Write an enzyme that holds these catalytic residues in place. Structure first.
Site, PDB file in Angstrom:
ATOM      1  N   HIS A   1       4.096   1.454   2.813  1.00 37.41           N
ATOM      2  CA  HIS A   1       4.397  -0.086   3.423  1.00 37.41           C
ATOM      3  C   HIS A   1       4.298  -0.971   2.535  1.00 37.41           C
ATOM      4  CE1 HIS A   1       1.011   2.377   6.284  1.00 37.41           C
ATOM      5  NE2 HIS A   1       0.809   2.699   4.997  1.00 37.41           N
TER       6      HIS A   1
ATOM      7  N   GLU B   1       1.094  -1.544   0.105  1.00 38.74           N
ATOM      8  CA  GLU B   1       0.107  -0.151  -0.127  1.00 38.74           C
ATOM      9  C   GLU B   1       1.042   1.094  -0.067  1.00 38.74           C
ATOM     10  OE1 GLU B   1      -2.212   0.364   3.366  1.00 38.74           O
ATOM     11  OE2 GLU B   1      -2.534   2.486   3.092  1.00 38.74           O
TER      12      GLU B   1
ATOM     13  N   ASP C   1       0.509   5.577   0.506  1.00 35.70           N
ATOM     14  CA  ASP C   1      -0.467   6.730   0.725  1.00 35.70           C
ATOM     15  C   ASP C   1       0.796   7.483  -0.204  1.00 35.70           C
ATOM     16  OD1 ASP C   1      -1.746   4.319   1.590  1.00 35.70           O
ATOM     17  OD2 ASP C   1      -1.155   4.748   3.781  1.00 35.70           O
TER      18      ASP C   1
ATOM     19  N   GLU D   1      -2.374  11.342   3.024  1.00 37.02           N
ATOM     20  CA  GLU D   1      -3.493  11.593   3.858  1.00 37.02           C
ATOM     21  C   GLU D   1      -3.566  12.454   4.108  1.00 37.02           C
ATOM     22  OE1 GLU D   1      -1.678   7.161   5.685  1.00 37.02           O
ATOM     23  OE2 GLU D   1      -3.388   7.132   5.538  1.00 37.02           O
TER      24      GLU D   1
END
Ligand SMILES: *[C@@H]1O[C@H](CO)[C@@H](O[C@@H]2O[C@H](CO)[C@@H](O[C@@H]3O[C@H](CO)[C@@H](O)[C@H](O)[C@@H]3O)[C@H](O)[C@H]2NC(C)=O)[C@H](O)[C@H]1NC(C)=O
Ligand SMILES: *[C@@H]1O[C@H](CO)[C@@H](O)[C@H](O)[C@H]1NC(C)=O
Length: 373
Positions: free
Chosen positions: A212, A196, A198, A201
Site C-alpha cells: 500500500h 505499509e 504487508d 496476512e
C-alpha cells in the site's frame, strides 16, 4: 511519556540476521516491543492518564502538561500473548481469563534495536525471509507480518521520553487516528498515514501480500493484494495442499528493482515458498510476482513503496480478528474457502482458543542470501 517505575519494561530478545552475498549472515541484537495503546499509563498518584482510548483531559490538557504528569508502564509479555525463544516468536490471539473465559489479547509487536529505536529494515532491492507456523489459525484469523514507515524513535520528543521502547508512533495505510499521533497527543484527532508493506496476512486457509503506497496526505487503503485462491489457484494454499499450511514453511519475499541495486526503482515483488527442503512451485507459472499495482497509481504506485522500503521501515508482527467482517476479505468468497459466518470471533474463541502464529528465523538482506543452499 516518561517511563514508569512500577512495571519495568523488558523487551524479549528475538534473534534476527542481516545477510550479505559475500559476508554471510550477521546476527542483530533485536527485541520486540508491544504497542503503545496496549499499555497502562498513570499519574504520580496512580490516576490513569488514559480513559477508553482517549486521554483523561484532567491530566493531559496539554502535551506539556501530559508529558510532565504521565508515566506509561511496562508489560507482562507472556500475559500479553507474546512468548519468545531464540529466533522464534509465538503470538496468541487469546489468553486465559481469571474470570473463567478467554481474554482477547491481540498483540502488536515491533522490531526494536539495541539503541532503543526501531530497527529499520531497508528492503528495496533486497529480500526478507522467515518461517511460519499458522496451522492452528482457522478462518477469520489474521497472522500478520508487515512493515510500516514509522519513525525510528517512535516519535519521541521533549515531552515524550518513552518513545519506541514503549511502542510509540504507530501508523499504517489505513491512516488510523491514534490518541498520540506519532508521539504526541492528537489534539487535532488527525489520521496517521504512512506506507505499509504487508508481507503476510494469512491463516491456514488463505493468504495475501499487499503493498500500500501513500502520498504524505493519504494512502491506497486496499492495495493490489496477491491471494493465490483469488487468482484462481484455490487448492494451492491449505492443509495438505501444494504448500502444506498444516506444517511449518518458509516465506521469501523479494523486492526487485530495475538497476538491481537498493539504489534503484522498485519494479516487482516476488514471492517464493520452500517447505520440506524443496522449493515449492509458484501458484502461477513464471512466478508469484506483483508488477502492476493499479490501485496505487494515484499515489505513485509501487515506486513510492520502493522508496519507503529503501528509506527503511518498522517490522510489525500482529495477530487479530474483526467482529465486523470476519476477515472474509482474506479467506472467504473468491478469496478463500471459508463461509461468510465461519470466520466470526465467537466461533473462533469457541472452537479454536489459543489459536496462535509462530514466526521464526527472520532474515533480510541481499537477494538470494537469506535462505540456505
Ligand atoms: C483524571 O484524572 C483525575 C486526576 O488524577 C482523576 O480524578 C481523581 O480520582 C481519584 C479517585 O477517584 C480521587 O481520589 C480521591 O481524592 C481525594 C482527595 O485527593 C481523597 O479524599 C479520596 O480519599 C481519594 O483519594 C482524586 O481526588 C481525583 N482527582 C481529581 C482532581 O478529580 C480521574 O480518575 C480522571 N478523570 C476521570 C473523569 O476519570
Ligand atoms: C514523528 O516524530 C518525530 C520526532 O518527534 C519526528 O521527527 C517525525 O517527523 C514525526 N513524524 C513524522 C510524520 O515525521
Amino acid at each position: 511519556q516518561q517511563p514508569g517505575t512500577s512495571t519495568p519494561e523488558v523487551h524479549p530478545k528475538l534473534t534476527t540476521y542481516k545477510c550479505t552475498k559475500s559476508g554471510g549472515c550477521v546476527a542483530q541484537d533485536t527485541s520486540v516491543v508491544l504497542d503503545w495503546n496496549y499499555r497502562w499509563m498513570h499519574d504520580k498518584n496512580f490516576n490513569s492518564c488514559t480513559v477508553n482510548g482517549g486521554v483523561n483531559t484532567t491530566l493531559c490538557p496539554d502535551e506539556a502538561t501530559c508529558g510532565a504528569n504521565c508515566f506509561i508502564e511496562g508489560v507482562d509479555y507472556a500475559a500479553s500473548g507474546v512468548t519468545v525463544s531464540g529466533s522464534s516468536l509465538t503470538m496468541n490471539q487469546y489468553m486465559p481469563s481469571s474470570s473463567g473465559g478467554y481474554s482477547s489479547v491481540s498483540p502488536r509487536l515491533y522490531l526494536l534495536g539495541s539503541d532503543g529505536d526501531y530497527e529499520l529494515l531497508q528492503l528495496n532491492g533486497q529480500e526478507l525471509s522467515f518461517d511460519v507456523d499458522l496451522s492452528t489459525l482457522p478462518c477469520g484469523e489474521n497472522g500478520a507480518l508487515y512493515l510500516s514507515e514509522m519513525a525510528a524513535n517512535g516519535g519521541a520528543n521533549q515531552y515524550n521520553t518513552a518513545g519506541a521502547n514503549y511502542g510509540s508512533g504507530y501508523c499504517d495505510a489505513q491512516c488510523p487516528v491514534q490518541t498520540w499521533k506519532n508521539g504526541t497527543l492528537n489534539t487535532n484527532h488527525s489520521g496517521y498515514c504512512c506506507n505499509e508493506m504487508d508481507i503476510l496476512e494469512a491463516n491456514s486457509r488463505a493468504n495475501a501480500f499487499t503493498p500500500h503506497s501513500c502520498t504524505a496526505t493519504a494512502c491506497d487503503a486496499s492495495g493490489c493484494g496477491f491471494n493465490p485462491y483469488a487468482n484462481g489457484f484455490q487448492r494451492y494454499w491449505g492443509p495438505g495442499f501444494t504448500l502444506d499450511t498444516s506444517k511449518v514453511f518458509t516465506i521469501i519475499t523479494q523486492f526487485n528493482t530495475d538497476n538491481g541495486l537498493p539504489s534503484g526503482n522498485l519494479v516487482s515483488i516476488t514471492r517464493k515458498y520452500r517447505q520440506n527442503g524443496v522449493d515449492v512451485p509458484s501458484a502461477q507459472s513464471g512466478g508469484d510476482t506483483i508488477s502492476s499495482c493499479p490501485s496505487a497509481s494515484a499515489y505513485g504506485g509501487l515506486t513510492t513503496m520502493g522508496k519507503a522500503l529503501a528509506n527503511g521501515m518498522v517490522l510489525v508482527f500482529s495477530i487479530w480478528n474483526d467482529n465486523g467482517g470476519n476477515m472474509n476479505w482474506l479467506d472467504s468468497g473468491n478469496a478463500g474457502p471459508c463461509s461468510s459466518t465461519e470466520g466470526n470471533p465467537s466461533t473462533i474463541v469457541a472452537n479454536n482458543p489459543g489459536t496462535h502464529v509462530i514466526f521464526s528465523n527472520i532474515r533480510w538482506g541481499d537477494i538470494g542470501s537469506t535462505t540456505g543452499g
